[PDB]
Amino acid sequence: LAKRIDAALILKDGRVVKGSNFENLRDSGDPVELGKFYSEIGIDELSFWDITASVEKRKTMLELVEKVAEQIDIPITVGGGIYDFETASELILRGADKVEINTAAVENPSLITQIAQTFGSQAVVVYIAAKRVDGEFMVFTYSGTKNTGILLRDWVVEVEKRGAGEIVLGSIDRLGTKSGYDTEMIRFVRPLTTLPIIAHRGAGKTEHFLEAFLAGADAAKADSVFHSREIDVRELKEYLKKHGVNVRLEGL
Numbered sequence: 001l002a003k004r005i006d007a008a009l010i011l012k013d014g015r016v017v018k019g020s021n022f023e024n025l026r027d028s029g030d031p032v033e034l035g036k037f038y039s040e041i042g043i044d045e046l047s048f049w050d051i052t053a054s055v056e057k058r059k060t061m062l063e064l065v066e067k068v069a070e071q072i073d074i075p076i077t078v079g080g081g082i083y084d085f086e087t088a089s090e091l092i093l094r095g096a097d098k099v100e101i102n103t104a105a106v107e108n109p110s111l112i113t114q115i116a117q118t119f120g121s122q123a124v125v126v127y128i129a130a131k132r133v134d135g136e137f138m139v140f141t142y143s144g145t146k147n148t149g150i151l152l153r154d155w156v157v158e159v160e161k162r163g164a165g166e167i168v169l170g171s172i173d174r175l176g177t178k179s180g181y182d183t184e185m186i187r188f189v190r191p192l193t194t195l196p197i198i199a200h201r202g203a204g205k206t207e208h209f210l211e212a213f214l215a216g217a218d219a220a221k222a223d224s225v226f227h228s229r230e231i232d233v234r235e236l237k238e239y240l241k242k243h244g245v246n247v248r249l250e251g252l
C-alpha cells in the first residue's frame, strides 16, 4: 500500500482541546471544520478521540459523527470511552468508519470479534499501549496506568487472531516527548503481525515520520504537532516522497 498520515483530534464536549493555529478557519476549535481542512491538505485518515466522561457524552459523539460523516471525504475513526458493543454499533451506524477500543478489548477480547463479525474487520481498530517493564514490552490499560501483565508479543498475535483490522502502536514512554516514534517497538511488533500498524506518540519533527516508516509502520498518527503548526502536513508529505516513501500527494 502507500503509507498514511493520520491526524488525531482530542475532544471535550465536542470541542477540540486547545484547538489549532490555522488562522484561516472560522472556528479553530471546531472539529468539523478542522477535520475537513486536514482532508483538503494531505491527511489520509482522521481520528476523533473524546476525553469527555459526562452524562450526555454518548450523544455529543453520535451528533458530531453525524455532522462529520456528511462532510468529510476520508476515513474517520472514533475512540475515547468505548467499552462495549452497544456504543460501537451505535457509532459505526451513525457514520463512523472504524471504532477504536483498548481497555475493553484487553478485558474482553471477544468484543473485537463481535464488532468485526457484524461490521467487518476493517471497522475495528485496537489501540495497544506499551512500555518497557524490566526489559520486556507490556501492554498497559486505563490510559496507560494499569500494567496488565500481558506481554505485547502475545497481545499483538491475539488481536490479529480475534479479527481486528489495524493496530495503533502507542509507546507510553513517549507521551508528550518530541524525540520520535519508538522505532524499536515498531520493529519489535512488525514481524508478529500482518495487520496494518499505525505508529503513535513521539512525533516532533519531519524526519521522525521517515524513521517510523522504515521501522515498518504502515501509518503514523500525530496531533498537537499538526494543530500547533510545528509540522506543515504538505511539507511533511513532500519530504516523505523526496526520500522514497510511498505517500499520495496532490500536485496543483
Ligand SMILES: N#Cc1cc([N+](=O)[O-])ccc1O
Residues within 6 Å of the ligand: 008, 009, 010, 047, 049, 127, 143, 168, 200, 221, 223
Ligand atoms: N489515537 C489516539 C489517542 C489515544 C489517546 N489515549 O489512549 O490517551 C489520547 C489521544 C489520542 O489521539
